[PDB]
Design an enzyme around this catalytic site. Structure first.
Site, short mmCIF file in Angstrom:
data_model
loop_
_atom_site.label_atom_id
_atom_site.label_comp_id
_atom_site.label_asym_id
_atom_site.label_seq_id
_atom_site.Cartn_x
_atom_site.Cartn_y
_atom_site.Cartn_z
N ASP A 186 0.82 -1.22 0.00
CA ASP A 186 0.00 0.00 0.00
C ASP A 186 0.86 1.27 0.00
OD1 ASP A 186 -2.41 1.46 -0.06
OD2 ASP A 186 -2.63 1.45 2.12
N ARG B 241 0.09 9.23 -0.14
CA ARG B 241 -0.79 9.37 1.03
C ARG B 241 -0.28 8.63 2.27
NH1 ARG B 241 -4.91 5.79 -1.59
NH2 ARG B 241 -3.09 4.40 -1.57
N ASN B 242 0.47 7.55 2.06
CA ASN B 242 1.05 6.75 3.16
C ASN B 242 2.54 7.04 3.38
OD1 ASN B 242 -1.44 5.42 3.66
ND2 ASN B 242 -0.99 3.90 2.07
N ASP C 213 1.66 3.53 7.62
CA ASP C 213 0.45 2.80 7.21
C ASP C 213 0.58 1.33 6.82
OD1 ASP C 213 -2.56 3.58 6.90
OD2 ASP C 213 -1.53 5.51 6.75
C1 KJR Z 1 -3.59 8.27 5.24
C2 KJR Z 1 -3.93 9.31 6.31
O1 KJR Z 1 -4.88 10.08 6.14
N1 KJR Z 1 -3.11 9.29 7.39
C3 KJR Z 1 -3.28 10.12 8.44
C4 KJR Z 1 -4.53 10.51 8.95
C5 KJR Z 1 -4.60 11.35 10.06
C6 KJR Z 1 -3.44 11.80 10.69
C7 KJR Z 1 -2.19 11.42 10.22
C8 KJR Z 1 -1.04 11.83 10.80
C9 KJR Z 1 -0.60 13.10 10.86
C10 KJR Z 1 -1.14 14.26 10.43
C11 KJR Z 1 -0.77 15.44 11.09
C12 KJR Z 1 -1.28 16.68 10.69
C13 KJR Z 1 -2.17 16.76 9.62
C14 KJR Z 1 -2.54 15.59 8.96
C15 KJR Z 1 -2.03 14.36 9.35
O2 KJR Z 1 0.56 13.09 11.48
C16 KJR Z 1 0.87 11.84 11.81
N2 KJR Z 1 1.95 11.37 12.45
C17 KJR Z 1 2.08 10.00 12.69
N3 KJR Z 1 1.07 9.17 12.26
C18 KJR Z 1 0.01 9.69 11.61
N4 KJR Z 1 -0.97 8.87 11.23
C19 KJR Z 1 -0.81 7.41 11.02
C20 KJR Z 1 -2.03 6.96 10.25
O3 KJR Z 1 -1.52 6.15 9.19
C21 KJR Z 1 -0.70 6.71 12.25
C22 KJR Z 1 -1.05 7.28 13.48
C23 KJR Z 1 -0.91 6.57 14.67
C24 KJR Z 1 -0.42 5.27 14.64
C25 KJR Z 1 -0.07 4.69 13.43
C26 KJR Z 1 -0.20 5.41 12.24
C27 KJR Z 1 -0.12 11.03 11.39
C28 KJR Z 1 -2.13 10.58 9.09
#
Ligand code: KJR
Ligand code: KJR
Lengths: 303, 303
Positions: free
Chosen positions: B142, B146-147, B160
């Site tokens: 994947d 986006r990831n 992701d």
């Molecule tokens: C694909 C997608 O939309 N991913 C996503 C969604 C929401 C938040 C985040 C994310 C962000 C972020 C920060 C500011 C604006 C927009 C997005 O920052 C992040 N830092 C670490 N992980 C993130 N998200 C992943 C989700 O794949 C994640 C979070 C916690 C545990 C595992 C993975 C994130 C990433």
């Protein structure tokens, strides 16, 4: 007798320029953002275009021409110059566009990213401009952060010569009558006796610096203009801005001496601020230039 | 037999961290922005916190733990690592906060200020991350713009791992069944036979680069996913982005060969993009890096 003023007043056709958008409005009339395109050349000049209103007051129309006279009579990198006028229904003043607007608004909405280098350099440029106007025998009578414009963040110019007056060779001061001048920027002798001199401008320069050093604070914020006369006579002055070393604040204080000749000349202010600009963090303390225990996850290795 | 996975799964108390704000939501659940504060230390770690929902689907709860397994089993500067989990009503994944969000959104809302240096460097970092996952015997399944997340504009990481799978030592491909995988980023052999390999990831890497080079365009923008199989079989591929030299676009095309082994290995992609990163304007043409007759008023002296 006196030096003949051989400045050229350029008359521009309305078809040569295009108003893109309105920039401001109020008591002064309206100012536009536009492009001036001289028909002969292959150039497009960004300009500010100022007019009064749909009506034409006899006394008001005369005063815009007085403003044109002075702006046409100045030529200096730190002073705004008139490009020309256009004789439409109401006369229009055309000048170089200063895209970043007035310095007062600029220091207000960029506090967080304005360093000591920029502040002290602006102080140098304004002093150079004011010094030029002194050589040109001109007293501005309305120097304030609001009447200094920003061409780029590193290049500012003095403008708004609506109250400016030209002094003769055998003349050290101008005597006003009409009044209605911004009280919180003018010297005590001007408030008390309507006396305006190059040293009266130095007072106003002092206040202008205070505005910059406080990132656009209103001087005497909670005081009505009626009381200003009293408090200055008592010895009360604008307070020391947080970021200001005694070194800088001493300069500001000297501009507000009761004896006008005891104040510094603009040429001296150029020197002092210029010296300071070489080592700016020695003279202004700014924390940039909500926790400190914060650490990024990959500088925190798993115990 | 195989190498024993000695990764540590850290269990964190809920009282140790504070949700500041919600970052996102949808089908995946919700992600929060927060601070993790280990009681013993004098540190505050910015973290992203992910949970599913108020309900607990048997199949969905299992899959978040599978995601934790893989993220806990990776350690690389260009891969997002699990800090720990918290066993609340529904399990929470805690990771390093990547403050600038996903790279897809970043290239979209910063088109005008993204230079060739940044693009090619991101390509190098993603290849390094993917190459690490290949050494770790992991197929991502994947990979897309986006990831990939942005820690700073100059440092990105792959995340992701919800679809990721670990391959054995005597195993070259993974066979899916469930399906429901983003079709426009996956190789033909994956669409046709549910075959996923490190070279299937290379296809997806190719598409990810296309996204970056087009500043976040949607691949096959006007095409439904049903047709994608047909057009790939015909030989149709994503078009050459305006900014892409044949040099860069040739790399992208090689990732989309029908023969999987004819595609480049991630280690080769690191090299090629790294070479290009040394002279970035030779390989990407970007006009930054509404008139040209415009001239400032003080470079136009009065004739
Ligand atoms: C694909 C997608 O939309 N991913 C996503 C969604 C929401 C938040 C985040 C994310 C962000 C972020 C920060 C500011 C604006 C927009 C997005 O920052 C992040 N830092 C670490 N992980 C993130 N998200 C992943 C989700 O794949 C994640 C979070 C916690 C545990 C595992 C993975 C994130 C990433
Ligand atoms: C004191 C004040 O409000 N001045 C003001 C008002 C409105 C516009 C301008 C102005 C601006 C500007 C641009 C963007 C945002 C805000 C302001 O830029 C300018 N460049 C040159 N002259 C300006 N105005 C003066 C008015 O003192 C002026 C215009 C035309 C002829 C003479 C003077 C300007 C300046």
């Amino acid at each position: 007798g006196e030096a003949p003023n051989q400045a050229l007043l350029r008359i521009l056709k309305e078809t040569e320029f295009k108003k893109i958008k309105v920039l401001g409005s109020g008591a002064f009339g309206t100012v536009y953002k536009g492009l001036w395109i001289p028909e002969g050349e292959k150039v497009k000049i960004p300009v500010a275009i100022k007019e009064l209103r749909e009506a034409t007051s006899p006394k008001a129309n005369k005063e815009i021409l007085d403003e044109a006279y002075v702006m046409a009579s100045v030529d200096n990198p730190h002073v705004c110059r008139l490009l020309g006028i256009c004789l439409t229904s109401t006369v229009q003043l055309i000048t170089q566009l200063m895209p970043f607007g007035c310095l007062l608004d600029y220091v207000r909405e960029h506090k967080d990213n304005i360093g000591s280098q920029y502040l002290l350099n602006w102080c140098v440029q304004i002093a150079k401009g004011m010094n030029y106007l002194e050589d040109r025998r001109l007293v501005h009578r309305d120097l304030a952060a609001r009447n200094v414009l920003v061409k780029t963040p590193q290049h500012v110019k003095i403008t708004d010569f609506g109250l400016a007056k030209l002094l003769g060779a055998e003349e050290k001061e101008y005597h006003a009558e009409g009044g209605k001048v911004p009280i919180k920027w003018m010297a005590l002798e001007s408030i008390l006796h309507r006396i305006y001199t190059h040293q009266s401008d130095v007072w106003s320069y002092g206040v202008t610096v205070w505005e910059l050093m406080t990132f656009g604070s209103k001087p005497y914020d909670g005081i009505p203009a009626s009381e200003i006369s009293s408090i200055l006579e008592k010895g009360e002055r604008l307070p020391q801005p947080p970021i200001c070393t005694i070194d800088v604040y001493m300069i500001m204080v000297k501009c507000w001496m009761i004896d006008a000749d005891s104040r510094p000349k603009f040429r001296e202010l150029i020197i002092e601020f210029s010296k300071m600009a070489r080592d700016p963090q020695r003279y202004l303390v700014i924390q940039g230039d909500d926790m400190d225990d914060v650490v990024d996850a990959d500088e925190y290795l798993i115990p």
